[PDB]
Swiss-Prot record:
Ranges where the Alpha-carbonic anhydrase domain occurs: 1-257
Disease in which the protein is involved: Osteopetrosis, autosomal recessive 3: A rare genetic disease characterized by abnormally dense bone, due to defective resorption of immature bone. Osteopetrosis occurs in two forms: a severe autosomal recessive form occurring in utero, infancy, or childhood, and a benign autosomal dominant form occurring in adolescence or adulthood. Recessive osteopetrosis commonly manifests in early infancy with macrocephaly, feeding difficulties, evolving blindness and deafness, bone marrow failure, severe anemia, and hepatosplenomegaly.
Cofactor: Zn(2+); Co(2+)
UniProt-reported outcome of changing G142R: In OPTB3; complete loss of activity
Stored InterPro entries: CA_dom, CA_dom_sf, Carbonic_anhydrase_a-class, Carbonic_anhydrase_a-class_CS
Keyword set, alphabetical order: Acetylation, Cell membrane, Cytoplasm, Disease variant, Lyase, Membrane, Metal-binding, Osteopetrosis, Phosphoprotein, Zinc
UniProt record similarity statement: Belongs to the alpha-carbonic anhydrase family.
Stated name of the protein: Carbonic anhydrase 2
Species of provenance: Homo sapiens
Effect of T196 to S/V: Reduced activity
Reported effect, V140H: Impaired activity
Amino acid sequence: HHWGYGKHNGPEHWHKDFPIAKGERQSPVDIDTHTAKYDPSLKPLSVSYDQATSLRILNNGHAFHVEFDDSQDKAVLKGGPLDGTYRLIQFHFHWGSLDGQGSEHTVDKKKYAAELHLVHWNTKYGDFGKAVQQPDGLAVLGIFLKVGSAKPGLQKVVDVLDSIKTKGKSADFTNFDPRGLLPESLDYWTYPGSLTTPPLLECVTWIVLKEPISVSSEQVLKFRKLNFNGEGEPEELMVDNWRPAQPLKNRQIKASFK
Ligand SMILES: [Zn+2]
């Protein structure tokens, strides 16, 4: 028995094993576009992924993750509301059983079909493990996905999902360029938050892009063919692996645009 997204181990149950689930800076949250404050002091985001080195893709039972080599400043995020350099370590998605749901963050209560999370850690802390224990340890770039035209740069990812259908499976995934998953504009909203999966640590500086990317119905459909279960067990489709919006509490969402 452990956490998941089912009726008996879902998000509503997480607080029993992870008390911080009821914390003061939990994520995701609903972004109220009319209450968000435009902050003129927010610097443009700086994304340097030209030297990114992907290593492997794996199904960990909660989602599928694409891991990168973070032993050097190959793929980093700077600028915006950030102080210092943050290295990309992995990216994963959150999707639904239907196109009308799937994203974790919502915009004026609107839900998207999926949400992409590019996770980076503050190099000042030496490694990911140390970074998660700090209030400014991580920086997660959130990108919304809507169903429409296919996204060419996502196809390499969808085609390998068949090889990691069940929990525990992993496969070599080299030379994948994450720049193909970025929207045209880098305008964003930012607020202090947490990881959206256990341990739910409050060490994240969220950067959510305003412009979503479009993916085809066929591409998202392949996401839905993955399994939460491990091989040799009753099949449970990996769908709706998203956490519902949490209380904003004493926090303000800032916008880089007006
Ligand atoms: Zn995530």
